[PDB]
Amino acid sequence: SKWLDGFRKWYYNAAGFNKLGLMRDDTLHETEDVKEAIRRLPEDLYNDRMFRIKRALDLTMRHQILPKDQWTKYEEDKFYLEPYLKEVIRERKEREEWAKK
Amino acid sequence: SPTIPSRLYSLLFRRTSTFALTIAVGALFFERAFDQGADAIYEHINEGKLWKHIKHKYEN
Amino acid sequence: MLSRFLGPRYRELARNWIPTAGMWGTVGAVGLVWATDWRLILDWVPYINGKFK
Amino acid sequence: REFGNLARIRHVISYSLSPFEQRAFPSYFSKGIPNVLRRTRERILRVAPPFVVVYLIYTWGNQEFEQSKRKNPAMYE
Amino acid sequence: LVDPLTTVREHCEQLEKCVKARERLELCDNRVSSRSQTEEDCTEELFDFLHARDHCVAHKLFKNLK
Amino acid sequence: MTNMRKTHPLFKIINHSFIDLPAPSNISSWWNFGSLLGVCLMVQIITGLFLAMHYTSDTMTAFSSVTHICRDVNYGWLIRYMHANGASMFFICLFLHVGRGLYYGSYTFMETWNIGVLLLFAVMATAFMGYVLPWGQMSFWGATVITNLLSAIPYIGTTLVEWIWGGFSVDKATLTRFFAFHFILPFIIAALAIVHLLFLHETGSNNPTGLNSDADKIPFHPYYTIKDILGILIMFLILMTLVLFFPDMLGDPDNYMPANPLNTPPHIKPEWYFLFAYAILRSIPNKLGGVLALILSILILALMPFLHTSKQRSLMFRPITQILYWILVANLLILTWIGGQPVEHPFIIIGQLASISYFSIILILMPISGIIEDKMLKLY
Amino acid sequence: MTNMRKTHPLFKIINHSFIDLPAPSNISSWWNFGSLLGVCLMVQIITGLFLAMHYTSDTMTAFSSVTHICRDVNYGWLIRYMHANGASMFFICLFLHVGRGLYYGSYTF
Amino acid sequence: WGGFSVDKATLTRFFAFHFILPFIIAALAIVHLLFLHETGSNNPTGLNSDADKI
Amino acid sequence: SDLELHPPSYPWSHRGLLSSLDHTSIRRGFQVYKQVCSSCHSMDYVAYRHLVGVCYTEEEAKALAEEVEVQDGPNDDGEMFMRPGKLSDYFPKPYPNPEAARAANNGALPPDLSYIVRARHGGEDYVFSLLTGYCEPPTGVSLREGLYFNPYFPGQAIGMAPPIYTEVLEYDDGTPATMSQVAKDVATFLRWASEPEHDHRKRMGLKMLLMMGLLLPLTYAMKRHKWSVLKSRKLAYRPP
Amino acid sequence: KGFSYLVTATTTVGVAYAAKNVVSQFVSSMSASADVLAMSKIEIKLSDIPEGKNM
Amino acid sequence: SHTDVKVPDFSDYRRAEVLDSTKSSKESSEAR
Numbered sequence A: 001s002k003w004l005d006g007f008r009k010w011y012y013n014a015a016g017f018n019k020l021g022l023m024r025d026d027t028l029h030e031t032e033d034v035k036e037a038i039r040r041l042p043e044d045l046y047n048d049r050m051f052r053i054k055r056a057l058d059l060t061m062r063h064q065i066l067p068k069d070q071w072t073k074y075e076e077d078k079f080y081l082e083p084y085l086k087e088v089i090r091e092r093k094e095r096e097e098w099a100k101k
Numbered sequence B: 001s002p003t004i005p006s007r008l009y010s011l012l013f014r015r016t017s018t019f020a021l022t023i024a025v026g027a028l029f030f031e032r033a034f035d036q037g038a039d040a041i042y043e044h045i046n047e048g049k050l051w052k053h054i055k056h057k058y059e060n
Numbered sequence C: 001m002l003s004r005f006l007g008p009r010y011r012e013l014a015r016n017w018i019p020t021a022g023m024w025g026t027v028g029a030v031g032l033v034w035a036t037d038w039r040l041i042l043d044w045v046p047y048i049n050g051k052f053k
Numbered sequence D: 001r002e003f004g005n006l007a008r009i010r011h012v013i014s015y016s017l018s019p020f021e022q023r024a025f026p027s028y029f030s031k032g033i034p035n036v037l038r039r040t041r042e043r044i045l046r047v048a049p050p051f052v053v054v055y056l057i058y059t060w061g062n063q064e065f066e067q068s069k070r071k072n073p074a075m076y077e
Numbered sequence E: 001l002v003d004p005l006t007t008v009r010e011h012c013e014q015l016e017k018c019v020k021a022r023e024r025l026e027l028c029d030n031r032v033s034s035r036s037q038t039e040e041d042c043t044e045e046l047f048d049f050l051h052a053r054d055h056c057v058a059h060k061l062f063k064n065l066k
Numbered sequence F: 001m002t003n004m005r006k007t008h009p010l011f012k013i014i015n016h017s018f019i020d021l022p023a024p025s026n027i028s029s030w031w032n033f034g035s036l037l038g039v040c041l042m043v044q045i046i047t048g049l050f051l052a053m054h055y056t057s058d059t060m061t062a063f064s065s066v067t068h069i070c071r072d073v074n075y076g077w078l079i080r081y082m083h084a085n086g087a088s089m090f091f092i093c094l095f096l097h098v099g100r101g102l103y104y105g106s107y108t109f110m111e112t113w114n115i116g117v118l119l120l121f122a123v124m125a126t127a128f129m130g131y132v133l134p135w136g137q138m139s140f141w142g143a144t145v146i147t148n149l150l151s152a153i154p155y156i157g158t159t160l161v162e163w164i165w166g167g168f169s170v171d172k173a174t175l176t177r178f179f180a181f182h183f184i185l186p187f188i189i190a191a192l193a194i195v196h197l198l199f200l201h202e203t204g205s206n207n208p209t210g211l212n213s214d215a216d217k218i219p220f221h222p223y224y225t226i227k228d229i230l231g232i233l234i235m236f237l238i239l240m241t242l243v244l245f246f247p248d249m250l251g252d253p254d255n256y257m258p259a260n261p262l263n264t265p266p267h268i269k270p271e272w273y274f275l276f277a278y279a280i281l282r283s284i285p286n287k288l289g290g291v292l293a294l295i296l297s298i299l300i301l302a303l304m305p306f307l308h309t310s311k312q313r314s315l316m317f318r319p320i321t322q323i324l325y326w327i328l329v330a331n332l333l334i335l336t337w338i339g340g341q342p343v344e345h346p347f348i349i350i351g352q353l354a355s356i357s358y359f360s361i362i363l364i365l366m367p368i369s370g371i372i373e374d375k376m377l378k379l380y
Numbered sequence G: 001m002t003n004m005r006k007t008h009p010l011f012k013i014i015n016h017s018f019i020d021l022p023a024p025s026n027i028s029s030w031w032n033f034g035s036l037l038g039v040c041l042m043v044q045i046i047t048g049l050f051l052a053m054h055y056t057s058d059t060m061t062a063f064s065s066v067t068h069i070c071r072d073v074n075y076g077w078l079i080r081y082m083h084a085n086g087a088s089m090f091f092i093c094l095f096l097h098v099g100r101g102l103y104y105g106s107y108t109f
Numbered sequence H: 001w002g003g004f005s006v007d008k009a010t011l012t013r014f015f016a017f018h019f020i021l022p023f024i025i026a027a028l029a030i031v032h033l034l035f036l037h038e039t040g041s042n043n044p045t046g047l048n049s050d051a052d053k054i
Numbered sequence I: 001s002d003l004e005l006h007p008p009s010y011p012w013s014h015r016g017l018l019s020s021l022d023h024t025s026i027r028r029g030f031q032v033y034k035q036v037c038s039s040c041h042s043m044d045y046v047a048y049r050h051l052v053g054v055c056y057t058e059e060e061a062k063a064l065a066e067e068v069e070v071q072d073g074p075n076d077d078g079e080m081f082m083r084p085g086k087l088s089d090y091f092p093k094p095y096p097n098p099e100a101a102r103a104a105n106n107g108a109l110p111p112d113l114s115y116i117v118r119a120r121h122g123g124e125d126y127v128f129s130l131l132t133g134y135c136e137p138p139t140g141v142s143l144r145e146g147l148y149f150n151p152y153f154p155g156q157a158i159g160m161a162p163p164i165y166t167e168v169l170e171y172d173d174g175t176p177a178t179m180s181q182v183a184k185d186v187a188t189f190l191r192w193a194s195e196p197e198h199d200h201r202k203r204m205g206l207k208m209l210l211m212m213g214l215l216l217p218l219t220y221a222m223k224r225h226k227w228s229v230l231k232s233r234k235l236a237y238r239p240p
Numbered sequence J: 001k002g003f004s005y006l007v008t009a010t011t012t013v014g015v016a017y018a019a020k021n022v023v024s025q026f027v028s029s030m031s032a033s034a035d036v037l038a039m040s041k042i043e044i045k046l047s048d049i050p051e052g053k054n055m
Numbered sequence K: 001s002h003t004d005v006k007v008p009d010f011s012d013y014r015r016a017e018v019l020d021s022t023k024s025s026k027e028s029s030e031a032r
């Protein structure tokens, strides 16, 4: 709804990972399937993610945040890791079902 | 005229052995200086209350 | 405890392992009563009645 | 495990200078105070409401305990 | 011998909070001593009066003592 | 010519563990508490070694020995108050260590977390027996109360309690055996801390962001060497300002009385961490239920690695669970205050509500908060 | 699946030090005395822990506590004599350890 | 001595020292075994045992 | 009753963080204990060797050690005998066992006045309030013989006769021996008895405060110096 | 295999018996002693107290 | 190209004797 988008944007600003330049797919925890997704990532996306995490670690070491214009926003928060992660989950569920059989 | 940090670095702080030597000499002299200063601060705060402050009416 | 442990293969594994697990529980119980000299259990086996414990 | 085979990072350039060539306290207050105020402003709505509920619970408990000690004037005879 | 504790205590009873506690004390004393057989005693108002009075004493006692 | 630091085996171990350890460059001041715990452990070991150098464990002479330490032994007052306030500082840094793990999701290191939980149990036992050691009123009566807590267990409680007591009460056998256990148990703590550090060193440390720290990693020397030196200095500041100005603000007054078995104190209060445990004990009005409540309240820390259902490791980017976590710290403080207070109205109902809220907020509410955050971030 | 014995860290340390350790096949009974010394240390640690469990260090009560261990404590005499003879036989095995070191050229380490 | 003769302070400090020292012995034994494992073990012949090991 | 009266916060001369004890008041309180409080209460842990260097000179402390008598022995027949005490001895006990104290003081045992300040809540404030707070009981409560009303004592009924009054003893320095002065002197002397390390501990604390106020800026300077490589470090990403 | 396993089984029984006896003696050492067992079942008590009194 | 890699300005952090680039060092390195 129209109310839901504004509340989600407010919660996204309250999360605070946009202030350090992250994205949601960067901030999700690195499990086994996540590691497989990062391995399956292309080279350019992997390099951008690695630089974003390194800059985030530098910023949190300095106890600073990015400027307001340089914060990432909700509309261009691309979900690059979503299809790779979804495919890894689907393959792992297929392996689990075959192990159940 | 060279600055006194430059003179300190040229004479003492360059070689590590001289660094340790001036560290130990400063340790001895600074321990003496702060012992004197800290006790003097203590008796100035506690004038008229300590045992050596009230001592002079009981030995003699 | 987890959702991956259903199906015929894991219940077949459980059916295969329950005699071994039961025998391990049996030797655990016998080792426990032998270690503690539990009179409440040892007073029914015949020879050990001579120990009075 | 050790340095060298930790992560694969490409095209990243880092600049740093000597500790002797820079200052240990570069504008320690003029940007130290606004950064501290910004951090408190960001993280002050997550700790202060629970802590003031602690203060209210503590004060109400002390007050009700003192009224429990307080003599009841209901029994006059 | 004049006692500085007694003089300070008299000054503190002269102070107004302690004499409000005092007047509650004779109200409770007349209340209790009016009856003959009861099991209600008021040490509590005495505790309040001693609390206020000795707090003011502790504020103003040790100046007279060396 | 070769590198002795990277070639000599002891020097190789020290280099790979403490010198050239790849550490994350952005860890906060909350990561100094591991080194603070190790330093307080060393301080406690040395200080108690001197105390037992001047201490005799016997019910006729335990209090006299502690008094002789405080009065006639040169600076033995400093030794004894340093030991007590260092135990308090150990528990402060230990709770901050646990809170750092809870807030930054370090419990995903399951083996390190479980070794830490065993360390926490060992530190509880060590501090309890050490507080029994000076043979005060609080020592004797806390020993009797916690041993009756052990006696609450059915069908073996009386036998284990008479075995632990070395008799049928807290007596000379109990005091001497508690001296032996209290001396020896910190060395088991040190060995378990070596195992703790090994299990951590397998996988590396954690950053406050909860992300992969291999992007920006720095050696442990000299950065975290001097950072831990500064932390040690600040901890020494707080510790000996407690020692030299307020040595008894965390102790108990009537503990300074000789232990009379016939006489009883009006109130029973151990130290503030045991006041937390005591409040959780007395919230539930039956013996076995309270004992299981205390044991379960310590084992939920080990249980929490299975309770992590969020897709984000740290609480840095999850604001609702931050509110839940600070509500948790809030009623840690509230339960400590209730354990301080005697059991009358309204402290009874306040402690009951605090304990049920504590167990609910850890067991059922944080996974719900995590899954709500995942739903709101379009992760579900 | 994996090999837990050589992949778990404490397990792989124990395996690499005590289980899969490449040892010389021809070492005689004189090489047992290192493990004898270690087990002596463990035995003395346990027995002395029990002795200090029932022992008080005061010149008025040291001998009294020793007598209490010898008589009143259940098997306390056994623990005390086990500690004393364990220390003596610990020194016997120490002397044989040292003798093996001088004889079989172990001082090159 | 803690004084001028063997007395109560000497006995108490000797109790403390005798309690603590076996754990230092255990730590030094860990160092002993670490050095030994680094350098390998010796055989009665005094030769290279690397040809035949079990 | 179940109520208790909290003693107030008196402004002691040693209440400050760097303020030592008044040793004239300490020795006056020692005299107060010696000819006032030593009849019933004991001090098992304070000695004349502790009195040397704080209260009196060595000769005066020695002389007041021979003014008492101490059991010692054995003699050549193996019997205990009286000898004049010396600086190494402790304060003489009024009763050999606590049951004698119970018999003499109507079932009430006076506790050891060697840790009473560190043992009671409030400390010297509690001692001063207890000694100065003797008053008649309120109307309605009754106490049997040997029991006296006191608001600060828990249970409100203490077994203690009012121990101090005006001119109960004569001081040596000419200080007026009023009841508040005697209570203050015995309170600070009990504070010294419960904590002989007060002045030395506060001097240690002042030294510690000065050195840590010097060392924290310097150690922080080293930390910021060593960390200035990272804290001013700049990053750049240059993809093709 | 039965002969070899009977040998190792009898050794296992022997070492189990020995270990259980040793740890039983240690746990009995940590149990109550002769002093506290002797001063437990006898209480020196008289009837030289009046009515309405507690000791 | 690699020539475009230029060190940014660090003048917000430099010492008081280092702020200018027209004055050579080693007259102030000893002092620092």
Ligand SMILES: CCCCCCCCCCCCCCCCCC(=O)OC[C@H](COP(=O)(O)OCCN)OC(=O)CCCCCCCCCCCCCCCCC
Binding pocket: A011, A013, A014, D041, D042, D043, D045, D046, D049, D050, D053, D054, F319, F320, F321, F323, F327, F330, F331, F334, F350, F353, F354, F355, F357
């Ligand atoms: C919806 C709120 C909207 C607020 C808007 C404020 C202005 C926003 C626009 C400008 C930006 C300002 C700076 C923003 C900083 C970060 C964002 C922030 O503070 O958000 C509000 C914060 C988090 O919001 P969220 O987690 O979504 O709230 C869900 C409600 N539970 O939520 C809060 O701060 C509210 C916290 C309330 C906590 C109440 C706890 C009550 C119970 C405590 C019990 C403790 C234990 C007591 C004992 C129990 C047993 C007896």
Ligand code: HEC
Binding pocket: I033, I036, I037, I039, I040, I041, I105, I108, I109, I110, I111, I116, I120, I127, I130, I131, I153, I154, I157, I158, I159, I160, I161, I163, I164, I186
């Ligand atoms: C014999 C009549 C005594 C004199 C003289 C002094 N004390 Fe007293 N003390 C005495 C008794 C019989 C008791 C126990 C009474 C009871 O009801 O328990 C005490 C106890 C104290 C206490 C402890 C109070 C508490 O709350 O625990 C204090 C602080 C105390 N006494 C102080 C005190 C001082 C400072 C004295 C010298 C002026 C003194 N007492 C004299 C018996 C007697």
Ligand code: HEM
Binding pocket: F030, F031, F032, F033, F034, F035, F037, F038, F041, F094, F097, F098, F101, F106, F107, F109, F112, F113, F115, F116, F117, F119, F120, F123, F193, F196, F197, F200, F204, F205, F206, F207, F301
């Ligand atoms: C009792 C003595 C303890 C000691 C001596 C000790 C020691 C240490 C040390 C030195 C570190 C490294 C410093 C750091 O990473 O911040 C550390 C980290 C850690 N400790 Fe402890 N610890 C103890 C107790 C605990 C407890 C009680 C817990 C949890 C309930 C715990 C869990 C952890 C975890 C998870 C880490 C990893 C931190 C990270 O990944 O960043 N430890 N410990």
Ligand code: HEM
Binding pocket: F041, F044, F045, F046, F047, F048, F049, F051, F052, F055, F066, F069, F080, F083, F084, F087, F090, F091, F123, F126, F127, F130, F131, F132, F133, F134, F182, F183, F184, F186, F187, F251
């Ligand atoms: C090798 C390590 C240790 C030794 C030898 C030791 C020894 C002692 C001794 C002899 C006492 C009694 C002296 C006295 O109280 O006056 C004591 C008291 C105490 N110990 Fe330890 N201890 C050690 C470690 C620890 C640890 C690790 C803790 C807590 C985490 C601890 C907590 C305490 C406490 C709380 C007291 C009581 C202090 C008081 O009552 O004020 N000790 N210790």
Ligand code: HEM
Binding pocket: G030, G031, G032, G033, G034, G035, G037, G038, G041, G094, G097, G098, G101, G106, G107, G109, H029, H032, H033, H036, H040, H041, H042, H043
């Ligand atoms: C005091 C406790 C000691 C313990 C726990 C201990 C432990 C051990 C162990 C387990 C071994 C392996 C067994 C073997 O190689 O024969 C060993 C070997 C060795 N020990 Fe010890 N030892 C101790 C004392 C000593 C002493 C006193 C010496 C020499 C003066 C020594 C020197 C050696 C040497 C050189 C070896 C290597 C021998 C070889 O590789 O064949 N150790 N030690």
Ligand code: HEM
Binding pocket: G041, G044, G045, G046, G047, G048, G049, G051, G052, G055, G066, G080, G083, G084, G087, G088, G090, H018, H019, H022, H023
């Ligand atoms: C944690 C380890 C240890 C503890 C707690 C301990 C404790 C004790 C205690 C309490 C005593 C007094 C009881 C008695 O004298 O019979 C004692 C005596 C003795 N200990 Fe230890 N001990 C330990 C390890 C050792 C070690 C490693 C050695 C030898 C290297 C040793 C040698 C002795 C000896 C010779 C005696 C004299 C016993 C006698 O002469 O009867 N102990 N020990």
